[PDB]
């Protein structure tokens, strides 16, 4: 068995690395299944020469809505839930991770089905915040996914695989994805159906 | 569909800004319904010129009280739920937003009707907290709100618009709220009734 | 109704400060009712010429203690509860307050009636910790409260009072306690008799 | 009743210290009950010239997994619990601590028996951050558990002891631990048989 973080707390990763690079976001998210779940899901990219630390994810959906007392609220933010209750929003940022909203009956995609996103009109922003290890100084770096970047039915490609005692990043795969076979039905649609 | 956040992380928000300029609260608070319930809402302002990281609100309710004992407790302190327990209280600050807590059985408006709000002696106090992207030190900025500047039965008016690629805001609309058709019982009473 | 704090944030306490000075915990905490809930309290005192930002109180339960398989802990600590789960524990200090731990099924006080307080071999630390706004560094301060510097059936005297369109703090007040009556069950005690 | 915090705040433990030294994970984990609960701990070591502000501890459980869907995760990061619901994992490091995350139907380990431990392909990797209060900035502290350095069956030995109204921190037993009678079952298992 090869480790990933040694006894003294030096990572296993980069082979040789010193620990401004600007953190990376995938270009895409997708949507697939997760044991039994549907999932969003967008990566988060590492920084070469430095840590993070304190270091968490948060999402915002930016989309303008209507209350059903007729005020409009042009882009109104609301939370995603991304590990927020549980601390997994708290990162061990070592080597790009994938986070994952299931999208649950709290999730704002739980009526979404596959035919029905890209008639949506809506986006989702993505705030990495940590303090840089070396610099001293608290960092934030954003993102966005609008509709058309959201791609339904695909998973990430892995990008971690082990190389000499060390682990390798293949950064050529970082926003690479693939499809695989994935219900077209939204959650709720999906859940409904598994109650019966 | 046009951006409000692009892939490289800077939002199209203030054509052509830098990304000690003060921090702004609306200088009133309303009460209105949003999807069936009873709403107390007040507006913070964004920062022209830099973001705010780890940025963060919360509140208080500064109201001098006796316990059931006879203790007097002048001025005593409660907090008000603004997203706390969603992580709704955690800003994306870009442009103004308008803070909402919902009114409900464990608020302390849950009993004050329309009527009955003018009699109450209290105190709302506001508190943005976050750190300067700039700057890097922490901020914290303070604004208060009483019985007289609660507007019962109102809504914010609408800052936000979509000029030429770019998402403008009329800052003089920013304290700018108008009149809308709302219930005068308590959320309490609003409660009671609707359930029967 | 004369505001505590002024719509620009300026708070309207301690006439004409500036906003190393220490940062007080009162000497002696005591348990008493509060609405039909029996509390332990002790006061934290305000920083004279600076605000603390992020500020937050935590407190912690030191007591040796035996497992159920004879493993022995000394001094083990536990978390008492002061206002975590509604962020009540986030102070707006800007007088001295006065935090409180409801004895519930959950406190390590639940059991511990008067009589049997004095035998207890225990200790609460008291953890005020936030961000001196002048300074722009981090601070901590700590105080101890031991079996025999917990009051059993007593409340903290008033500090505040309003002078002159400002609050005054009387600070020789700060740790005067007064004696109330106050059942000498212990919560358990007082919850199963009122259950019936 | 020696007191282990004075009134001042001065700690009463490493007679005559100050308050760059490391922080210290000892080597090996133990799994063993503690009030009927199966429990995994490792033990954190305090920084003996410095205290360490809005300090924090979390664990990764770092684990190669499979989606039901055939989707494989080397390496897949998941929080362990240890005390960040209750604010447990806020620590009030003066002294080593024994950190505890309880084997539950929630733990990643609740279907993990001793025979099937070494069978495992798993990394913990536990984590400290904290301000360190003397040089002002955030730290950083990692090491790392793999499956052969948990101890099945075993406790911490005690690192304390009350030496001339001071206490004194025994580190040569730091990372020491001894047998202890623990029943081999897993945690579920364990729960399947305690419920008949
Ligand atoms: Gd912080
Ligand atoms: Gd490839
Ligand atoms: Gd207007
Ligand atoms: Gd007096
Ligand atoms: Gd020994």
Redesign the interface.
């Known amino acids: 068995?090869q480790?990933?973080?040694?006894?003294?707390?030096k990572?296993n990763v980069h082979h040789g690395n010193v620990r401004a690079e600007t953190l990376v976001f995938s270009?895409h998210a997708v949507i697939?299944?997760?044991?039994?779940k549907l999932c969003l899901m967008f990566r988060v990219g590492d920084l070469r020469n430095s840590?993070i630390?304190?270091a968490s994810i948060?999402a915002?959906l930016?989309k303008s809505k209507q209350?059903?007392?007729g005020?409009?609220?042009?882009?109104n933010?609301?939370?995603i839930n991304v590990?927020?209750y549980?601390?997994?929003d708290?990162l061990?940022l070592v080597?790009p991770?994938?986070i994952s909203h299931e999208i649950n009956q709290q999730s704002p995609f739980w009526e979404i089905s596959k035919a029905q996103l890209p008639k949506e009109?809506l986006?989702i922003?993505v705030?990495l915040?940590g303090?840089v290890?070396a610099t001293?100084?608290?960092?934030?770096?954003?993102?966005?996914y609008?509709?058309?970047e959201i791609l339904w039915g695909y998973?990430f490609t892995?990008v971690?695989?082990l190389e000499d005692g060390f682990?390798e990043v293949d950064y050529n795969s970082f926003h690479e994805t693939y499809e695989?076979?994935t219900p077209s039905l939204s959650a709720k649609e999906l859940a409904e159906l598994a109650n019966r």
């Open positions: 068995i480790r990933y973080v040694r006894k003294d707390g990572c270009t697939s299944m997760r044991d039994g840590h630390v304190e948060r915002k930016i209350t059903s007392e005020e409009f609220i042009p882009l933010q609301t939370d590990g927020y549980t601390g997994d708290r061990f080597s991770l994938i009109e986006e922003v705030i915040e303090m290890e001293g100084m608290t960092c934030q770096a954003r993102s966005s609008i509709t058309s998973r892995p971690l695989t682990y695989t076979s």
